Amino acid sequence: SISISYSTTYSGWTVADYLADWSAYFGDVVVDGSNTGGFNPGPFDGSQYALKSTASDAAFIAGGDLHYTLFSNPSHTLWGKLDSIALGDTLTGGASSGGYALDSQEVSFSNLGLDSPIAQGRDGTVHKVVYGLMSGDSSALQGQIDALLKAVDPSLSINSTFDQLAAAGVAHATPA
Amino acid sequence: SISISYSTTYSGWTVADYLADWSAYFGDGQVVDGSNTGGFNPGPFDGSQYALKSTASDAAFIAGGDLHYTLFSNPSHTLWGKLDSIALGDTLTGGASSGGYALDSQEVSFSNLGLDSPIAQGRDGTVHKVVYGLMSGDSSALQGQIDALLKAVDPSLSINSTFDQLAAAGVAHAT
Numbered sequence A: 001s002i003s004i005s006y007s008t009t010y011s012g013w014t015v016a017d018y019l020a021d022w023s024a025y026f027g028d029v030v031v032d033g034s035n036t037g038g039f040n041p042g043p044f045d046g047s048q049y050a051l052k053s054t055a056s057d058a059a060f061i062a063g064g065d066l067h068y069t070l071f072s073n074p075s076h077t078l079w080g081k082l083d084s085i086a087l088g089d090t091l092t093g094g095a096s097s098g099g100y101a102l103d104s105q106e107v108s109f110s111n112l113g114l115d116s117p118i119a120q121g122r123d124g125t126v127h128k129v130v131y132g133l134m135s136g137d138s139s140a141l142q143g144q145i146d147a148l149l150k151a152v153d154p155s156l157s158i159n160s161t162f163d164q165l166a167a168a169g170v171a172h173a174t175p176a
Numbered sequence B: 001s002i003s004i005s006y007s008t009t010y011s012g013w014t015v016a017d018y019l020a021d022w023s024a025y026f027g028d029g030q031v032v033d034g035s036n037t038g039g040f041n042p043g044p045f046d047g048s049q050y051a052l053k054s055t056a057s058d059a060a061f062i063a064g065g066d067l068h069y070t071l072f073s074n075p076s077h078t079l080w081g082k083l084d085s086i087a088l089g090d091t092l093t094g095g096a097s098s099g100g101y102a103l104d105s106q107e108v109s110f111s112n113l114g115l116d117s118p119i120a121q122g123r124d125g126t127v128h129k130v131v132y133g134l135m136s137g138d139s140s141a142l143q144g145q146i147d148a149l150l151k152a153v154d155p156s157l158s159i160n161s162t163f164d165q166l167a168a169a170g171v172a173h174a175t
């Protein structure tokens, strides 16, 4: 089931609270090179999709087995399997580096278990999750995390603190 | 007409020998990837620059002008538009985000190439050949145009002239 890493800095924050603040920090991103983001290995598919903010040093990384349709029907659909979302700050590496990595990784969500097929187009969950983050709207990631936590134990939710989810077996603290 | 910039390092080199050496250095089925697409500035598929790093070494180049790339549209996988410059060297930095590509060490820059190729010509256009050739480290299409451009200025000048010699002529300038 879902597993979570967090920086001690965020020990007392609720996930809903952390994800709202992370997204306002990242902001909203005409599409061009500064703005498309990147796939590993790419160009339009890979095990990792990563995007830097145009506004701040915030950065994120979506991992699993992902496919972007670009202009093919249904256009501008991200689909595939999404296993991880890693949020933080200052993106590094890429296709010729062997993977994207965050220099300062604040929080990660792993074993999401999300899978959307091409046929749902842009209404697919994987699409609505990653596109949300690109756009400064983590609400779709929030909604999805909330369901994973609830199925583990009906007491846990995006309004649990990270530390409470550590007590629950789900989260695991790291330095800062 | 054509103008060259070169690092005093290559003052003694012929244009042909330097392009032979850069190509050897850049290097030579291979699945198309983030590691060999290069990129456009602003991009993603159009800009005032295209640039690529070799996967084998630090070698890299920047094609400058007003460039368009068809990708999957027709004619498929065609670079067209205007190509004014090719810069060759080491250590590609920058991007759309940094407001431009650059080379931390630019060795040679060929400018005022006056190359202009329409969409219709597809992959048979001179812009496409020059640049695709360079995407695999092959400077022969580039070399061919630079030679014809050197000569139009004066027949005594050519790809076999040293950069020093193209300076003395008035075509080249030391960086």
Ligand code: HEM
Pocket (backbone or CB within 6 Å): A031, A032, A036, A037, A038, A039, A043, A044, A049, A068, A076, A077, A078, A122, A126, A127, A130, A131, B044
């Ligand atoms: C990573 C490589 C990507 C590239 C090169 C790319 C490129 C583009 C470009 C060039 C456009 C402009 C469309 C237009 O103005 O006609 C666009 C729009 C769009 N992209 Fe991407 N994108 C990438 C990744 C993603 C991802 C991962 C998602 C979703 C998670 C996405 C979703 C969209 C959506 C929804 C649009 C809106 C199209 C519209 O205006 O209706 N893109 N993309």
Ligand code: HEM
Pocket (backbone or CB within 6 Å): A043, B032, B037, B038, B039, B040, B044, B045, B050, B069, B071, B077, B078, B079, B123, B128, B129, B131, B132, B133, B135
């Ligand atoms: C943003 C940069 C580029 C991207 C993302 C890109 C993407 C691709 C991809 C994915 C393919 C493979 C088609 C396939 O096998 O499924 C391809 C092929 C090709 N590209 Fe590019 N390309 C780029 C730049 C260029 C440039 C600048 C040129 C010309 C100077 C070019 C010329 C070609 C040619 C001739 C092929 C066909 C090779 C073959 O089918 O064997 N590409 N491109």
